[PDB]
A paper describes a structure:
One of these energy-consuming enzymes is the conserved huge AAA+-type ATPase [name] (also known as Mdn1), which is composed of a hexameric AAA+-ATPase domain, followed by a long tail consisting of an α-helical linker region, a flexible aspartate/glutamate (D/E)-rich domain and a C-terminal metal-ion-dependent adhesion site ([name]) homologous to the inserted (I) domain within the α-subunits (αI) of integrins that mediate ligand recognition. The conserved interaction between the C-terminal [name]-[name] and the Rsa4-UBL (ubiquitin-like domain) or Ytm1-UBL is essential for assembly of the 60S pre-ribosome in a reaction mediated by the [name] ATPase upon ATP hydrolysis that leads to the removal of Ytm1 and Rsa4 from distinct pre-60S intermediates. In this study, we report crystal structures of the [name] (Ct) [name]-[name], both alone and in complex with its pre-ribosomal substrates, the CtYtm1- or CtRsa4-UBL domains. Besides displaying the typical [name] fold known for integrins, the CtRea1-[name] crystal structures reveal evolutionary conserved [name] specific structural elements.
However, due to the low yield and solubility of this construct, we switched to the thermostable [name]-[name] from [name] (Ct). This construct (CtRea1-[name]) carries a ~105 residue-long N-terminal extension, which is absent from integrin [name] domains but is known to contribute to Ytm1 and Rsa4 binding both in yeast and human. We were able to purify the CtRea1-[name] construct in sufficient amount to allow us to obtain crystals and determine its crystal structure at 2.3 Å (for data collection and refinement statistics). However, the CtRea1-[name] contains three additional conserved structural elements (termed elements I, II and III) that are not present in integrin-[name] domains. The first half of the [name]-specific N-terminal extension contains a long α-helix (element I), which wraps around the [name] domain core. Although this part of the N-terminal extension (amino acids 4693–4732) has a low-sequence conservation, it contains an invariant tryptophan residue in the first part of the helix (W4710 in [name] and W4633 in S. cerevisiae), which packs between helices α3 and α4 and most likely anchors the N-terminal helix in place. The second [name]-specific [name] element (II, termed loop) forms a 45 amino-acid-long disordered loop (amino acids 4733–4777) opposite the critical DxSxS motif. The third [name] element (III) is located in the C-terminal region preceding the last α-helix of the classical α/β Rossmann fold. Rigid body fitting of the CtRea1-[name] into the density map of S. pombe [name] unambiguously identified the [name]-[name] loop attached to the [name]-AAA+ inner pore ring.
Numbering used by the authors: 4693 to 4743, 4753 to 4886, 4891 to 4935, 4942 to 5000
Write the structure that this text describes.
Amino acid sequence: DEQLKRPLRDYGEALEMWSTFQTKTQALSQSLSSQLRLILTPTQSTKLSGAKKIIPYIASSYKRDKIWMRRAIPSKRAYQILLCVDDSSSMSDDNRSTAGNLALESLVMVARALTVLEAGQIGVMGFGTDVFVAHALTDPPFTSQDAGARVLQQFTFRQDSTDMVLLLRRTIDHFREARLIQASSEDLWQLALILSDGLVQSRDHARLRPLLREAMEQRVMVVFIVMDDASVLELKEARFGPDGVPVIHRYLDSFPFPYYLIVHHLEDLPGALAALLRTWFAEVNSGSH
């Protein structure tokens, strides 16, 4: 907490960032939210049992189908997503890497998609040497521009190291805290989405294993998104829409084990987050297991 007295970004600047990223990602946020709504909607087909054709008059009103929808998505299941963003200087790289910005832009895309969807809670954590909650799961969803500015303010990408072990334990802790709350008024699905740049040497994989093992016993699912790009001003201009990758086939196949999605091109970052989220929502939702 004492290390947290870093200076924040200028509010006007963070406000303009949020607004710019929202405009740049709105198409993808809207598409993704319509895909997640479809995934959560009961859509199982009818089934055959046992063993002139009658042609009944089958009619309904579109009005009535919107009413069925208002009751259709069950509130017994909630989704909790912690989006964890590397707050170290490796993300800034003296403006050379540009990864920090693309990561915040992806955060905006996800936050807007979950808000429009009106299902799930979003939380945001930053991590480097310390770990801070930039936006708690119990905070109001990102409908207001102030709430978006305030999250982006907290990310300046100047911590000097990345301590993945600490991030994992706090993430586990925060999810445990969240499970206790719902035990006293509720099926709860929890996902940590961890974005960072650089390399992973397997010296890194191994020391994460006990915590990841602990997370799995607590049904927490963990996905690492690893950015490693080897220009900057047209990223500024870039507009994001659907890129044609609905799911991560390999992650679907490994569910619910921890997964590393390696993203070599930063303009794929928002696409890759969208695809991971669709995959996860599809998996936690299927009656499987």
